[PDB]
Subunit: 132 residues, 2 copies
């Protein structure tokens, strides 16, 4: 159910509406802090517009999921938006189902916990604490 | 473009017609010899209907992308067909562009070499030989 929220967000980042999705867009800031220029990362490093762009993107994020799903969710939604804006919506659909399905349960719970805290106004940002 | 012909075949195996494509369908027999019942490979071993089916399929064939495009092309086309028939056409399109572009130029030329021979009636089946310069 939270999986499905994540999938929906990644799949439809470009047009989607609702508070929970606006919340998730605040994760962009983490990706920007981490990589600096996202366009450069997408266009020059990963070549996301190439014929292998979907697979090269997933290969880039595959190990960092268990490090920080916040980053992977942010990057996946941004590349999905990029692909939708270049008529590769099919890649958005393929990415969303696989990223959402591949976040391990520990990391999924962690993301849900920190998002919940943000959504109730307990925290300024979506943090990375574990609910022990 | 030969590459684009392969992409078209994989993308649209379920509905595509034409001499080049019916020829590529003869490669199924290679896949069936290699792996046996394709349905079992797809449904039980690879679980291609799962949310990660696309990526699990690509991972399964990735070792052959470089060295045996006959089998990779056949299996990709067959799983594409399966996904079109189970309402996941978006997977057909993601698969076709990636597989077609990930086959090395030398293996491309090889497939083209053997396919042309088949289509010209010089061989009974689509072989796996190299021309003088790649052998
Ligand atoms: Na020939």
């Amino acid at each position: 159910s939270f999986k499905l929220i994540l999938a929906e967000y990644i799949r439809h980042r470009n047009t989607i509406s609702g508070n929970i999705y606006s919340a998730l867009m605040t994760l962009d800031d983490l990706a920007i802090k981490q990589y600096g220029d996202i366009d450069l990362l997408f266009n020059e490093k990963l070549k996301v517009d190439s014929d292998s762009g979907l697979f090269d993107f997933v290969n880039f994020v595959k190990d960092m999921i268990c490090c920080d799903s916040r980053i992977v969710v942010a990057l996946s939604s941004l590349v999905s938006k990029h692909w939708e804006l270049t008529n590769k919506k099919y890649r958005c659909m393929a990415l969303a189902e696989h990223i959402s399905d591949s976040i391990p349960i520990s990391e999924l719970s962690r993301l849900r916990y920190n998002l919940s805290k943000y959504l109730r106004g307990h925290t300024e940002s979506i943090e990375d604490k574990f609910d022990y």
